Design an enzyme around this catalytic site. Structure first.
Site, PDB file in Angstrom:
ATOM      1  CE1 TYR A 182      85.225  31.444  84.016  1.00 48.06           C
ATOM      2  CE2 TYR A 182      84.220  29.024  83.959  1.00 48.06           C
ATOM      3  CZ  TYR A 182      85.387  29.972  83.570  1.00 48.06           C
ATOM      4  OH  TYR A 182      86.516  29.888  82.755  1.00 48.06           O
ATOM      5  CB  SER A 224      78.785  32.124  91.764  1.00 46.76           C
ATOM      6  OG  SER A 224      79.664  31.008  91.938  1.00 46.76           O
ATOM      7  CG  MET A 225      83.958  33.318  89.626  1.00 50.27           C
ATOM      8  SD  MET A 225      84.632  33.112  87.979  1.00 50.27           S
ATOM      9  CE  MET A 225      85.498  31.766  88.436  1.00 50.27           C
ATOM     10  CD1 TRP A 273      84.140  29.402  94.555  1.00 44.61           C
ATOM     11  CD2 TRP A 273      85.363  30.749  93.374  1.00 44.61           C
ATOM     12  NE1 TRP A 273      85.199  28.798  94.314  1.00 44.61           N
ATOM     13  CE2 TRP A 273      86.239  29.830  93.845  1.00 44.61           C
ATOM     14  CE3 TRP A 273      85.682  31.881  92.482  1.00 44.61           C
ATOM     15  CZ2 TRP A 273      87.327  29.552  93.049  1.00 44.61           C
ATOM     16  CZ3 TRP A 273      87.204  31.830  91.831  1.00 44.61           C
ATOM     17  CH2 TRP A 273      87.823  30.665  92.329  1.00 44.61           C
ATOM     18  CG  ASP A 293      76.917  26.586  96.741  1.00 46.46           C
ATOM     19  OD1 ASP A 293      77.651  25.841  95.828  1.00 46.46           O
ATOM     20  OD2 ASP A 293      76.756  27.895  96.458  1.00 46.46           O
ATOM     21  CG  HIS A 298      76.296  27.403  92.923  1.00 48.83           C
ATOM     22  ND1 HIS A 298      77.070  28.306  93.790  1.00 48.83           N
ATOM     23  CD2 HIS A 298      76.449  28.082  91.789  1.00 48.83           C
ATOM     24  CE1 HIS A 298      77.806  29.055  93.311  1.00 48.83           C
ATOM     25  NE2 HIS A 298      77.508  28.974  92.022  1.00 48.83           N
TER      26      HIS A 298
END
Ligand SMILES: [Cl-]
Ligand SMILES: [Cl-]
Ligand SMILES: [Cl-]
Length: 263
Positions: free
Chosen positions: A59, A132-133, A157, A178, A209
Site C-alpha cells: 500500500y 505486504s498487500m 499482509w 514488523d 516491515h
C-alpha cells in the site's frame, strides 16, 4: 535431463552474491495492460527459455520498494516484471488481478517480435512475489491460479490469514519487529494456514516491515533464498533443493519453518 535447468551448479556463496551468472537488461513497458506501470528485467544469455515472475509492492508503495529482486532474479535466469498498481491505494484483490495482468503481458511480449523478451519466456512457468498487500495479492494469485509454479512473499499482509487452498510452493519472509504486518498475528498465521503445499517461513532478525525491500542489509541471505526457491520450484531444478530447503545458519535468520520441501 531437466529441460528447464539453466546456469552452473550453484553454491551458497554464489547465491549470496549480488549477481548471478547471466547479464541483465531491462525495459519500461510502453502500454501497460491492466496495471499501472512495469519494468521488465531479463537475462540476455540464459541458454533457453526461462520462467516469468511478477512482483507487486505494498500500500502506497512503488516499484523501487521491491525492484532489487528484478536483477537479482533475472541474473539467475528469469524474466521479472516489477509493477506499479493502477492506484497506490489498491487493496489485495486488485493487486492480485493486476499481478496476473502483468504476467499476461509478459506472455504477450514473449510473442511480440519487437520486444526484447521475444521468445525468451516459457509462458507455462510463472511465479508471483510481493510485499505486504502485494504479498497478500500474491497469495490470492496462487490460490486462484494453482498452475503458478512458485510464490515468494515478504512481510505479507491481507484481510484474511486463511490461505489453506494454496497448492503452489510458497516462501514467506517475515520481519521480526514488523509492526505493520506483525509476525505473530499476520505472517505466521498465513504460513500455518497452508497444509497442501511446499512452504517455508524465514524470520529476519530485527527487521522492520521493510526488511526484505530494496536496500535491506540482508540481500545476501534473502536473495539466496528467493532465488533458490524460484529455481527449485519454477525450474524443477533439484540442484537447488539443498538451498531451497536448508535451515540456514545465518545470524540474519531468527526463525525457520518448512514443510513438504523434499531434499
Ligand atoms: Cl500494505
Ligand atoms: Cl481475490
Ligand atoms: Cl515496522
Amino acid at each position: 535431463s531437466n529441460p528447464y535447468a539453466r546456469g552452473p551448479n550453484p553454491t551458497a556463496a554464489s547465491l549470496e552474491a549480488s549477481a548471478g551468472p547471466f547479464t541483465v537488461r531491462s525495459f519500461t513497458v510502453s502500454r501497460p495492460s491492466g496495471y499501472g506501470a512495469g519494468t521488465v528485467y531479463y537475462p540476455t544469455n540464459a541458454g533457453g527459455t526461462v520462467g516469468a515472475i511478477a512482483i507487486v509492492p505494498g500500500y502506497t508503495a512503488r516499484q523501487s520498494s521491491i525492484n532489487w529482486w528484478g536483477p537479482r532474479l533475472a541474473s539467475h535466469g528469469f524474466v521479472v516484471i516489477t509493477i506499479d498498481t493502477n492506484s497506490t491505494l489498491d487493496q489485495p484483490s486488485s493487486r492480485s488481478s493486476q499481478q496476473m495482468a502483468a504476467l499476461r503481458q509478459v506472455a504477450s511480449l514473449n510473442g511480440t517480435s519487437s520486444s526484447p523478451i521475444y521468445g525468451k519466456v516459457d509462458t507455462a512457468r510463472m511465479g508471483v512475489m510481493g510485499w505486504s498487500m502485494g504479498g497478500g495479492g500474491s497469495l490470492r494469485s496462487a490460490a486462484n491460479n494453482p498452475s503458478l509454479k512458485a510464490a515468494a512473499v515478504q512481510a505479507p499482509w491481507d484481510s484474511s490469514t486463511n490461505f489453506s487452498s494454496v497448492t503452489v510452493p510458497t516462501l514467506i519472509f517475515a520481519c521480526e519487529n514488523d509492526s505493520i504486518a506483525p509476525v505473530n498475528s499476520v505472517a505466521l498465521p498465513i504460513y500455518d494456514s497452508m497444509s497442501r503445499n511446499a512452504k517455508q517461513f524465514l524470520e529476519i532478525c530485527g527487521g522492520s516491515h521493510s526488511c526484505a525491500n530494496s536496500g535491506n542489509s540482508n540481500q545476501d541471505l534473502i536473495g539466496k533464498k528467493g532465488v533458490a526457491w524460484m529455481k527449485r520450484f519454477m525450474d524443477n531444478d533439484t540442484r537447488y533443493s539443498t538451498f531451497a530447503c536448508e535451515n540456514p545458519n545465518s545470524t540474519a535468520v531468527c526463525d525457520f519453518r518448512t514443510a513438504n520441501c523434499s531434499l
